[PDB]
């Protein structure tokens, strides 16, 4: 099953909801209300984390970022997890940003449930340790 | 049907599957399309009740609600012996009706 | 096991194995089983008297079931396999679904160890083991013969000699050892445990073939899958 | 008593798993017979073996043990003979014995 | 294998080995297709081998109930049904180990919106 | 319904179209020798293959392994039908090249089955 059909399946999830007239208290997103983590998939490999944060900031303030990278070479696998400060920004981003094109590639944005953080057992990098323990965020 | 010259029967070797008819087709004969005097039960070939199609209408293809029979006159002429009487193509009339309603509606 | 012990004692002319003097006499049940094991190899008669077969096996320093199987069964190649019976490089000489066959090409290419992952010690003994078994066959007029196909020739010998070991994991009439789909019956050299039941050095064998050889000891169908319709269900 | 409708020759499998009915030419049908759990006879849909232009002199069921049922036939093909104006092809066409196997796994009859 | 139900188990004996090897070995996107194929081959096969294959593929499906991947969910609903037909599963085993994660992961509002998932 | 029921009619069901295979068996002009029956168990195939490959490769002007393997696959049955093979190749080759092609491949197979070794005469020579 091609990834584009996954992008289309989330969009049809939304259109179908509109046709049936479902209320927001029982929307599909309400199953993911507890979490503030969203999966982004299909990204171009040229994008770095400043790019991801630069664009997905339209809907709120990003708390943490996990663009998963190859262990040996360090290059990007293409998918990362973002945590928003508001949980409602996840609704806005899954609706609005699913299936948009960046450098000619469509991306899928979906809610992630019970996201489990990476263990700091590895001492491979330092900046990743800073990102895990502290993470990106405005400083007064 | 006898009213549509472009429809085509399956005519393969019929089997132990019983052919059925949807509410619209209930009480009519599969061959000559009559309402009277039902003589024998219709058997359909294996392929025609494959899978999801098991139990659909013989004549049109909708959800079947009763058993299909041949009439007495088709029995006497031995029209009941030609094969699977499942209709295998929609034909021009059914297709035209769809596009016409869809144009309007 | 007391099986070979009996064939060695019954050679000595001891008519009573119950009351014979040992320092610590073995269980009476283990005797009855051992007496029963030489029975089904045809090394004895029904009343416990030696046959021409049983008298012959005692000239081999072997387990009698194995020797019997070899004799009954490929004589040059049984002489090859039985001697042996006493993973990349493994693949080349190891035919799928069988262990004697794998052993067969093992020795055959030996007289044709380090780089094949074989031990020069095991083979140098087996070289002499095969050497002595040949001298023992020739002495008593056991004919030297060859067959067109070794797999067919060797399969029969395993079924006969070892028949007491056959499994239908598998069920004996147990799980496979790390050593090695149509086949459902097997024949196996040795049995061992670590945490479980382990089957060692095995060969595929049809149930029907075993019955033909050992009818007393042992004393596929194509059927249509779907049930059809009865007259009541049809109308 | 039609020429192509079966009924003339009738052969049963010696174990009792199938029955085969054939006409004089180009039409054979195998029925698979079985027993249900109430020990009643059940029948299947027919499997057909058709071969055009072909005469059958006799059909008998072969006693293979419990393998796939076999049926043997005394066939003859008249196709070539009707296209030789000289009449040689009638003279030197010859009868064949053909074996049909009912493959109970794949539910079809193979010549 | 869907088209041939319930015949051909003897024709498919040749591919049961690479299929199995892939299911034990592969992880990721190959697994959906290989798991689908094995789920359709289970009703074709007789009871002795069906009881074998159903147990290990049940263990794979318990792990895959978690998976937030749309093709994997479409697959494992079907394969749950196909392993539930055979008699090699026990009723106690199903209501003890299939049933709580099944009703926690599949009876959701987003499952009801797509018609094939419904 | 997993697909539609309706998939088109087969040629055994539909009388509106004539049998194109029989019609072509009438009107194409076939080579002289293709009526002689061939038994392929008596023929060695892999020695025949490089000549075919080369023959098709120069007729085509390039190499098409689908046409190659198609020709080989038709020769796998015990009695290969030569007229159907000339018809089935006529689309790819000229239809004049197909006739010549069968006209040399077929006596070659005849020569191969007359041999005991499986090898035709011109290949025993060379
Ligand atoms: Zn209807
Ligand atoms: Zn009528
Ligand atoms: Zn039909």
Domain of A129, CATH number, reads: 3.30.70.330
Contacts of F72 (CB under 8 A, 6+ apart): F45, F49, F52
Chain C positions in Cβ-Cβ contact with residue D46 (cut-off 8 Å):
none
Chain C positions in Cβ-Cβ contact with residue B18 (cut-off 8 Å):
234-235
* DSSP type of residue D4: S
- CA dihedral for C114, C118, C124, C130, sign (positive or negative): negative
Biggest distance spanned by C-alpha atoms of chain F: 62
8-27 in chain D: CB under 8 A from chain E: none
Q: Do F2 and B88 touch (CB under 8 A)?
A: no
* DSSP type of residue C161: H
In this structure, which topology does domain F20-125 adopt according to CATH? PWI domain (1.20.1390)
Say if residues C68 and C57 touch (Cβ distance below 8 Å).
Answer: yes
**CA separation (Å) from F109 to A118, D69, F59, F119?**
69, 36, 20, 9
Distance from CA of A92 to the nearest CA of E (A): 17
Say if residues B42 and B30 touch (Cβ distance below 8 Å).
Answer: yes
Q: Which residues of C192-229 are buried (b: 16+ CB within 10 A; e: fewer)?
A: eeeeebbbebbbbbeeeebeeebeeebeeebebeeebb
Angle between helices C75-85 and C150-161 (to 10 degrees): 60
Q: Give one word for D68, left, alpha or beta, with left for phi > 0 and alpha for psi -120 to 50.
A: beta
Distance (Å, whole) CA E33 – CA E29: 8
Say if residues E81 and E45 touch (Cβ distance below 8 Å).
Answer: no
Say if residues A94 and A59 touch (Cβ distance below 8 Å).
Answer: no
With vertex at residue C176, the alpha carbon angle to CA C173 and CA C182, rounded to the nearest 5 degrees, is: 70
3-class secondary-structure state, position B63: strand
Of B36, B39, B38, B17, whose CA–CA distance to B86 is shortest? B17
Distance from CA of A6 to the nearest CA of E (A): 7
Task: Output phi, psi for D49, to 5 deg.
Answer: -125, 105
Q: Give one word for C134, left, alpha or beta, with left for phi > 0 and alpha for psi -120 to 50.
A: alpha
With vertex at residue E54, the alpha carbon angle to CA E49 and CA E57, rounded to the nearest 5 degrees, is: 130
Strand ranges across the sheet with C166-167: C166-167, C186-193, C197-204, C175-176
Q: Do A13 and E71 touch (CB under 8 A)?
A: no
- CA dihedral for C188, C193, C195, C200, sign (positive or negative): negative
In terms of residues, how long is chain E? 118
* DSSP type of residue C75: H
Distance (Å, whole) CA C57 – CA C136: 10
Contacts of B102 (CB under 8 A, 6+ apart): none
Radius of gyration of chain D, Cα coordinates, nearest whole angstrom? 16
Task: Output phi, psi for A57, to 5 deg.
Answer: -80, -5
> Domain segments of chain B: what residues?
1-105
B39 marked as binding residue: no
With vertex at residue E40, the alpha carbon angle to CA E36 and CA E41, rounded to the nearest 5 degrees, is: 115
**CA separation (Å) from C203 to C98, C162, C166, D85, F69?**
4, 11, 10, 64, 40
Angle between helices F82-90 and F20-27 (to 10 degrees): 100
Q: Give one word for D108, left, alpha or beta, with left for phi > 0 and alpha for psi -120 to 50.
A: beta
3-class secondary-structure state, position E57: helix
- CA dihedral for D7, D12, D13, D17, sign (positive or negative): positive
Question: What separation in Å is there between the alpha carbon of B45 and the centre of ligand 1?
Answer: 17
User: Which subunits sit against D, judged by 3+ Cβ pairs under 8 A?
Assistant: B, C, E
- The helix or strand, by DSSP H or E, that contains position A18, with its residue range, turns out to be helix A3-20
> Residue C198: beta bridge partners?
C175, C192
> Residue D9: beta bridge partners?
D22
Contacts of D3 (CB under 8 A, 6+ apart): D23, D24, D25
Contacts of B64 (CB under 8 A, 6+ apart): B19, B20, B21, B22, B55, B56, B57, B58
Distance (Å, whole) CA C204 – CA C100: 10
Q: Note down the domain range covering A63.
A: 3-134
Of D80, D91, D87, whose CA–CA distance to F35 is shortest? D80
Let me know if residue A139 belongs to a domain: no
Asked, as a colleague might, if the bond just before A76 is cis with ω within 30 of 0, I would say no
With vertex at residue D92, the alpha carbon angle to CA D86 and CA D97, rounded to the nearest 5 degrees, is: 145
B48 marked as binding residue: yes
Biggest distance spanned by C-alpha atoms of chain A: 51
Question: What separation in Å is there between the alpha carbon of B42 and the centre of ligand 2?
Answer: 11
Chain A positions in Cβ-Cβ contact with residue E113 (cut-off 8 Å):
13, 16-17, 20, 28
Q: What is the DSSP string of C125-138?
A: HHHHHHHHHHHHHH
Distance (Å, whole) CA E74 – CA E64: 11
3-class secondary-structure state, position D54: strand
3-class secondary-structure state, position D82: helix
Distance (Å, whole) CA C3 – CA E109: 72
> Residue D33: beta bridge partners?
D43
Contacts of E108 (CB under 8 A, 6+ apart): A31
> Residue C175: beta bridge partners?
C198
Contacts of E116 (CB under 8 A, 6+ apart): E74
Q: Which residues of B80-99 are buried (b: 16+ CB within 10 A; e: fewer)?
A: beebbbbbbbbeeeeeeeee
Distance (Å, whole) CA C13 – CA C9: 7
Contacts of D98 (CB under 8 A, 6+ apart): D72, D73, D75, D111
Say if residues B10 and F7 touch (Cβ distance below 8 Å).
Answer: no
- The helix or strand, by DSSP H or E, that contains position D73, with its residue range, turns out to be strand D70-77
Of C171, C161, C176, whose CA–CA distance to C217 is shortest? C161
Going by their DSSP bridges, the two strands C175-176 and C197-204 should be labelled as parallel
End-to-end Cα separation, chain E, in angstroms: 24
Question: What separation in Å is there between the alpha carbon of B58 and the centre of ligand 2?
Answer: 14
Q: According to DSSP H, which parts of F44-126 are helical?
A: 49-60, 65-74, 82-90, 97-114, 121-125
Going by their DSSP bridges, the two strands A76-84 and A62-69 should be labelled as antiparallel
> Residue A109: beta bridge partners?
A40
Distance (Å, whole) CA C26 – CA E83: 53
Give the count of domains, chain A.
1
Distance (Å, whole) CA B68 – CA B76: 17
Going by their DSSP bridges, the two strands A108-112 and A37-41 should be labelled as antiparallel
Say if residues D44 and C224 touch (Cβ distance below 8 Å).
Answer: yes
3-class secondary-structure state, position E104: helix
> Residue A51: beta bridge partners?
none
Say if residues E73 and E118 touch (Cβ distance below 8 Å).
Answer: no
Choose the closest CB to C224 out of D34, D40, D41. D34
With vertex at residue D4, the alpha carbon angle to CA C235 and CA D7, rounded to the nearest 5 degrees, is: 55
End-to-end Cα separation, chain F, in angstroms: 61
Number of A to E CB contacts under 8 A, please give it: 29
With vertex at residue A103, the alpha carbon angle to CA A99 and CA A106, rounded to the nearest 5 degrees, is: 20
Listed in order, strand segments (DSSP E) in C70-207 are 166-167, 175-176, 186-193, 197-204
Distance (Å, whole) CA C164 – CA C40: 9
Distance from CA of D30 to the nearest CA of B (A): 12
B54 touches chain F (CB under 8 A): no
Distance (Å, whole) CA E103 – CA E98: 9
Chain C positions in Cβ-Cβ contact with residue B80 (cut-off 8 Å):
none
Distance (Å, whole) CA C83 – CA C70: 10
Distance (Å, whole) CA E52 – CA E35: 15
Please note each residue after which chain E is broken, C-to-N distance over 2.5 A, or write none.
none
CA dihedral E14, E18, E24, E28 (to 10 degrees): -130
Q: From the CB coordinates, do chains D and C have 3 or more pairs under 8 Å?
A: yes
Say if residues C205 and C165 touch (Cβ distance below 8 Å).
Answer: no
**CA separation (Å) from D100 to B71, D57, D68, D111?**
38, 15, 10, 4
Contacts of E36 (CB under 8 A, 6+ apart): E75, E78, E79
CA nearest to C182 within chain E: E13
Q: Which residues of C touch E (CB under 8 A)?
A: 181-182, 225-226
Of A96, A125, A105, A120, whose CA–CA distance to A38 is shortest? A96
Distance (Å, whole) CA C91 – CA C89: 5
């Amino acid at each position: 099953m091609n990834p584009l059909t996954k992008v289309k399946l989330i969009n049809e999830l939304n259109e179908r909801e509109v046709q049936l007239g479902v209320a927001d208290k029982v929307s599909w997103h309400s199953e993911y209300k507890d979490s503030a983590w969203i999966f982004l998939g299909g990204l171009p490999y040229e994008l770095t984390e400043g790019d991801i944060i630069c664009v997905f900031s339209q809907y709120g303030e990003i708390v943490n970022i996990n663009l998963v990278r190859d262990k040996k070479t360090g290059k990007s696998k293409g998918f990362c997890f973002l945590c928003y400060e508001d949980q409602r920004s996840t609704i806005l981003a899954v609706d609005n940003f699913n299936g948009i094109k960046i450098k000619g590639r469509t991306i899928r944005v979906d809610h992630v449930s019970n996201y489990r953080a990476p263990k700091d057992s590895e001492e491979i990098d330092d900046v990743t340790r800073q990102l895990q323990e502290k993470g990106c965020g405005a400083r007064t | 049907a006898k009213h549509h010259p472009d429809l085509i029967f399956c005519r393969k070797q019929a089997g132990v599957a019983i052919g059925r008819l949807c509410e619209k087709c209930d009480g009519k004969c599969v061959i000559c399309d009559s309402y009277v005097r039902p003589c024998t039960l219709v058997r359909i070939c294996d392929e025609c009740n494959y899978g999801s199609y098991q139990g659909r209408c013989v004549i049109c293809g909708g959800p079947g609600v009763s058993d299909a029979y041949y009439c007495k006159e088709c029995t006497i002429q031995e029209k009941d012996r030609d094969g699977c009487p499942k209709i295998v193509n929609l034909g021009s009339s059914k297709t035209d009706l769809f596009y016409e309603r869809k144009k309007y509606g | 096991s007391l099986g070979n012990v009996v064939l060695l004692l019954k050679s000595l002319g001891i008519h009573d194995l119950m009351h014979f003097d040992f320092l610590d006499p073995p269980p009476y049940e283990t005797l009855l089983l051992a007496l029963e094991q030489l029975y089904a190899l045809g090394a004895l008669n029904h009343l416990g008297e030696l046959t021409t077969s049983g008298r012959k096996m005692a000239e081999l320093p072997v387990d009698p079931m194995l020797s019997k199987m070899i004799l009954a069964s490929c004589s040059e190649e049984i002489l090859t396999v039985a001697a042996m019976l006493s993973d990349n490089a493994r693949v080349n000489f190891f035919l799928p679904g069988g262990d004697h066959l794998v052993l067969l090409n093992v020795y055959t290419q030996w007289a044709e160890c380090y780089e094949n992952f074989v031990q020069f010690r095991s083979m140098r003994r087996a070289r002499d083991v095969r050497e002595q078994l040949e001298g023992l066959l020739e002495r008593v007029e056991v004919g030297l013969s060859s067959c067109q196909g070794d797999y067919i020739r060797v399969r029969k010998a395993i079924t006969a000699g070892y028949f007491y070991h056959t499994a239908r994991g598998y069920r004996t009439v147990v799980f496979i050892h790390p050593n090695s789909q149509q086949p459902r019956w097997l024949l196996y050299h040795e049995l061992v445990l670590t945490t479980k039941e382990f089957m060692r050095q095995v060969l595929e064998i049809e149930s029907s073939w075993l019955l033909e050889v050992a009818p007393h000891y042992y004393k596929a169908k194509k059927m249509p899958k779907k049930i059809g319709k009865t007259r009541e269900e049809l109308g | 008593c039609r020429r192509i409708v079966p009924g003339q020759f009738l052969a049963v499998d010696p174990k009792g798993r199938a029955v085969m009915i054939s006409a004089i030419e180009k039409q054979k049908l195998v029925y698979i017979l079985n027993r249900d759990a109430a020990a009643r006879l059940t029948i299947s849909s027919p499997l057909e073996a058709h071969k055009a232009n072909t005469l059958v002199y006799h059909v008998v069921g072969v006693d293979v043990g419990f393998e796939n049922p076999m049926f043997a036939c005394l066939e003859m093909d008249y196709e070539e003979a009707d296209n030789d104006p000289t009449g040689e092809a009638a003279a030197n066409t010859q009868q064949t014995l053909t074996f049909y196997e009912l493959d109970l796994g794949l539910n079809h009859v193979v010549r | 294998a869907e088209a041939a139900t319930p015949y051909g188990i003897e024709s498919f004996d040749s591919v049961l080995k690479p299929l199995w090897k892939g299911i034990r070995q592969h992880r990721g996107k190959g697994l959906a297709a290989f798991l689908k194929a094995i789920g359709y081959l289970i009703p074709l096969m007789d009871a002795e081998y069906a009881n074998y294959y159903t147990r290990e593929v049940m263990l794979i499906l318990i792990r895959e109930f978690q998976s937030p991947d749309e093709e994997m969910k479409k697959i494992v609903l079907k394969v749950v049904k196909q392993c539930c037909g055979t008699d090699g599963v026990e009723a106690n085993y199903i209501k003890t180990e299939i049933l709580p994660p099944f009703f926690k992961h599949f009876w959701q509002h987003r499952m009801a919106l797509d018609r094939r998932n419904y | 319904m997993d697909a539609g029921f309706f998939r088109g009619t087969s040629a055994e069901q539909d009388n509106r179209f004539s049998n194109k295979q029989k019609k072509l068996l009438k009107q194409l002009k076939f080579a002289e020798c293709l009526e002689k029956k061939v038994d392929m168990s008596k023929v060695n195939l892999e020695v025949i293959k490089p000549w075919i490959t080369k023959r098709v490769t120069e007729i085509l002007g390039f190499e098409d392994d689908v046409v190659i393997e198609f020709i080989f696959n038709q020769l796998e049955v015990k009695n290969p039908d030569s007229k159907m093979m000339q018809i089935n190749l006529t689309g790819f080759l000229n239809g004049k090249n197909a006739r010549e092609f069968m006209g040399e491949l077929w006596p070659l197979l005849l020569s191969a089955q007359e041999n005991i070794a499986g090898i035709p005469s011109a290949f025993l020579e060379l």
